[PDB]
Point group: none
Chain length 89, copies 2
C-alpha cells in the first residue's frame, strides 16, 4: 500500500499530505477551500515531514528515503531545494 | 527501504530525525549549527514521534515497534526511559 505523512499549521488549517507512491512523492495541500496539488514532487519509497512557524511564515522539512539513503527537501517560503541532512557524524 | 519519522520545535528550530534500519532506530539532531548524532538508540523496524514544549523545555516520545509490540521511549530533560504505554485495554 502507499505511504503517507502529514503536517499542518495555523487556526486556518493548512495541511500538507505527502504520498510515497511507487518511488514517487506527491504533495496534497488544503488552505481552507478545496484540496489541491502542491509544488512538491521528489523520488522516494518512504516519507516523514515536520513544519514550524516564524510568525505566520511556514517552513516545512520533508524526509524522503530510498534504500538506506535519506534526503531532506526544504521549504522556506521561496522554492523546494535540497537540504544539508546526512545520516552519519 | 529505511523508514524515518521527524519532529521539531521552536523557531531556531531543533529537529530530531529517527531512522528505522535493520531492526535498529538511531536519532539525528540539529539545533542551528550542523546535524549531529543523538543519545537515542532503540530496537524497532518502525518509528513514530511527537514532541511538546513546556515553556522552552522539550519532551519527546518515540514509538518503536517490532512485530505487534510497541515500546514508548521518553525524553523529558534528563535521559531516555521506557514509557508506560501499552497497545491493549
Ligand atoms: C472542512 O473540511 C474538513 O476539514 C479540513 C481541515 C480538511 O481536513 C477537509 O478535507 C475536511 O473535509
Ligand atoms: C505556496 O505553495 C504551496 O504551499 C507551500 C507551503 C508548499 O507546500 C508548496 O509545495 C505548495 O505548492
Ligand atoms: C539551514 O539549513 C537548512 O535548514 C535547517 C533547518 C535544516 O533542515 C538543514 O538540514 C537545512 O539545510
Ligand atoms: C540534549 O540531548 C539531545 O537532545 C535531546 C532533546 C534528545 O533528542 C537527545 O537524545 C539528544 O542527544
Ligand atoms: C508520565 O508518564 C510518561 O509520560 C506520558 C506523557 C506518557 O508518554 C506515558 O506513557 C509516560 O510513561
Amino acid at each position: 500500500s502507499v505511504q503517507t505523512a502529514a503536517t499542518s499549521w495555523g487556526t486556518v488549517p493548512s495541511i500538507r499530505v505527502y504520498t510515497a507512491n511507487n518511488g514517487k512523492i506527491t504533495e496534497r495541500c488544503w488552505d481552507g477551500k478545496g484540496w489541491y496539488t502542491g509544488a512538491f514532487n521528489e523520488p522516494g519509497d518512504n516519507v516523514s515531514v515536520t513544519s514550524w512557524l516564524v510568525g505566520s511564515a511556514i517552513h516545512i522539512r520533508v524526509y524522503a528515503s530510498t534504500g538506506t539513503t535519506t534526503t531532506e527537501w526544504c521549504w522556506d517560503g521561496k522554492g523546494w531545494y535540497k537540504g544539508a541532512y546526512t545520516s552519519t557524524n
